[PDB]
Amino acid sequence: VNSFSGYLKLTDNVYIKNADIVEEAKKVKPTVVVNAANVYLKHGGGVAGALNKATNNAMQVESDDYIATNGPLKVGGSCVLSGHNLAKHCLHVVGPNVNKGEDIQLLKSAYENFNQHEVLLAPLLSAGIFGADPIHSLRVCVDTVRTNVYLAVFDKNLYDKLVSSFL
Ligand SMILES: CC(C)[C@H]1CCCN1c1ncnc2[nH]ccc12
Numbered sequence: 001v002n003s004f005s006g007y008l009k010l011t012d013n014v015y016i017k018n019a020d021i022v023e024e025a026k027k028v029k030p031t032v033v034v035n036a037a038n039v040y041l042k043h044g045g046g047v048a049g050a051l052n053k054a055t056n057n058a059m060q061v062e063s064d065d066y067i068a069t070n071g072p073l074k075v076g077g078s079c080v081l082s083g084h085n086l087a088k089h090c091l092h093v094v095g096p097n098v099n100k101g102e103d104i105q106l107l108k109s110a111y112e113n114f115n116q117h118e119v120l121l122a123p124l125l126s127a128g129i130f131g132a133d134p135i136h137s138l139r140v141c142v143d144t145v146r147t148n149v150y151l152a153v154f155d156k157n158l159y160d161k162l163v164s165s166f167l
């Protein structure tokens with residue numbers, strides 16, 4: 001039993017809710033919140049810009065030190081950093097950005113990072129300003145993640161389409 005509330009159960013391990021991931025994280029304080037990161041951990045917009053804003057830029061400060069030490073992530077890769085005031089940890093995961101011409105097959109690799117964590121709060125990878133088809137992202141999530149994932153979808157109209165079209 002966990003404190004996530006109001007989720008629709010899509011499968012044995014995948015749950016979904018129309019919710020602002022920022023507000024969800026502040027309420028639940030999950031062990032792991034997933035960020036929709038880029039390889040430079042430059043949290044300027046989309047989910048990443050919103051999460052970073054909620055940390056008063058502490059996420060960005062920590063991220064800049066991480067990049068200065070380690071260099072950029074790989075597309076499809078991840079790193080674990082602090083969750084600041086939002087969660088114990090933040091798993092920064094880089095899905096392919098279609099508006100950069102990145103290979104959509106890497107979306108499965110991106111979701112594989114979730115399997116290293118028993119329970120996560122997360123957005124749909126490569127959705128929003130990353131330009132992938134969210135119905136596809138949900139399909140890959142369900143077919144790749146085996147741990148317990150609670151998906152927050154910001155857009156109510158998109159949420160209704162994902163549920164109604166879910167096979
Ligand atoms: C609409 C969703 C599929 C993705 C794509 C863009 C933004 N988005 C978000 N999802 C969850 N929580 C969020 N908080 C702020 C933005 C945001």
Ligand SMILES: [Cl-]
Nearest residue numbers: 046047128129
């Ligand atoms: Cl985004």
